[PDB]
Amino acid sequence: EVPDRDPEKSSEDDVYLHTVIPAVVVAAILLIAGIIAMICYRKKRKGK
Amino acid sequence: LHDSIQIPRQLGEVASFGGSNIEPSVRSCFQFANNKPEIEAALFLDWMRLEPQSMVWLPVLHRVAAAETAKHQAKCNICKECPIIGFRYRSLKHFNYDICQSCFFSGRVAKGHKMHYPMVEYCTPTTSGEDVRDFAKVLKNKFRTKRYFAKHPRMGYLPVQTVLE
Ligand SMILES: [Zn+2]
């Protein structure tokens, strides 16, 4: 009793998730923050 | 009306506001009030809230008093003032054009552009919405050429534009 078959399809998905995704989300956060700041920033006249 | 125009008479400029003749002001105020027998407070308020010719020296004065310590984030295209302190004047048929109050009243005529075009007056520092609206107005005017209306002589160009505080 010793069966051995090798259909294993290894793929480097852990590295992609650990590396690309955090920087993509950081870039998205920075972009939305910049756009919001530019739309805002002195849209209101504080009279008196 | 007479007591009010007494002050310009002291300084010898009452002719601009129509002179000592107060009767046309009464005629205009009664035309507004459909010849009402009497005039109340609110009617007078509404009558003067539309820049009456003889009374322009009351609001403008206060307006000047409201723009003696205002600092804008801009520059004067003529004398290279940075920043403008006091009034601010923005062009409408041009881009990135601004001039200070002294450069406007005195007439520093830089070669290339004249000062007989519509202007916009700002006392308080402007906001982003005003800037983008001015941009849109300039863009719209850029396609409304061929001199629909022109005013070369001065004749009195006091009510430039209202800021509505
Ligand atoms: Zn200037």
UniProtKB/Swiss-Prot annotation, chain A:
PTM field: N-glycosylated.
Motif placement: Nuclear localization signal: 42-48
Cellular location(s): Cell membrane; Cytoplasm, Cytoskeleton; Nucleus, Nucleoplasm; Cell membrane, Sarcolemma
Compositionally biased spans, kind Basic and acidic residues: 2-12
Transmembrane segments: 20-40
Role according to the record: Transmembrane protein that plays important roles in connecting the extracellular matrix to the cytoskeleton. Acts as a cell adhesion receptor in both muscle and non-muscle tissues. Receptor for both DMD and UTRN and, through these interactions, scaffolds axin to the cytoskeleton. Also functions in cell adhesion-mediated signaling and implicated in cell polarity.
Protein known as: Beta-dystroglycan
Organism: Mus musculus (Mouse)
Organism ancestry: Eukaryota, Metazoa, Chordata, Craniata, Vertebrata
Full protein segment contained here: 733 to 780 of 893
Swiss-Prot record, chain B:
Places the protein is found: Cell membrane, Sarcolemma; Cytoplasm, Cytoskeleton; Postsynaptic cell membrane
Binding site for Zn(2+): 76, 79, 100, 103
Tissue expression notes: Detected in quadriceps muscle and in sciatic nerve (at protein level). Expressed in the sarcolemma of the soleus muscle (at protein level). Differentially expressed during skeletal muscle, heart, and brain development. Also expressed in retina.
Knocked-out gene: effects: Mutant mice show reduced contractile force compared to wild-types, at least for soleus muscle. They have decreased motor activity levels after exercise, increased muscle permeability and fibrosis with impaired regeneration. MEGF10 and DMD double knockout animals have pronounced fiber size variability and intracellular inclusions in the quadriceps femoris with extensive endomysial connective tissue infiltration. Mice develop muscle weakness, kyphosis and a waddling gait. At 2 months of age, they have reduced contractile force compared to wild-type mice.
Signal peptide as annotated in the record: none
Zinc fingers classed as ZZ-type: ranges: 71-127
Binding partners and assembly: Interacts with SYNM. Interacts with the syntrophins SNTG1 and SNTG2. Interacts with KRT19. Component of the dystrophin-associated glycoprotein complex which is composed of three subcomplexes: a cytoplasmic complex comprised of DMD (or UTRN), DTNA and a number of syntrophins, such as SNTB1, SNTB2, SNTG1 and SNTG2, the transmembrane dystroglycan complex, and the sarcoglycan-sarcospan complex. Interacts with DAG1 (betaDAG1) with DMD; the interaction is inhibited by phosphorylation on the PPXY motif of DAG1. Interacts with SYNM; SNTA1 and SNTB1. Interacts with CMYA5.
Function: Anchors the extracellular matrix to the cytoskeleton via F-actin. Ligand for dystroglycan. Component of the dystrophin-associated glycoprotein complex which accumulates at the neuromuscular junction (NMJ) and at a variety of synapses in the peripheral and central nervous systems and has a structural function in stabilizing the sarcolemma. Also implicated in signaling events and synaptic transmission.
The protein's name: Dystrophin
Organism: Mus musculus (Mouse)
Gene: Dmd
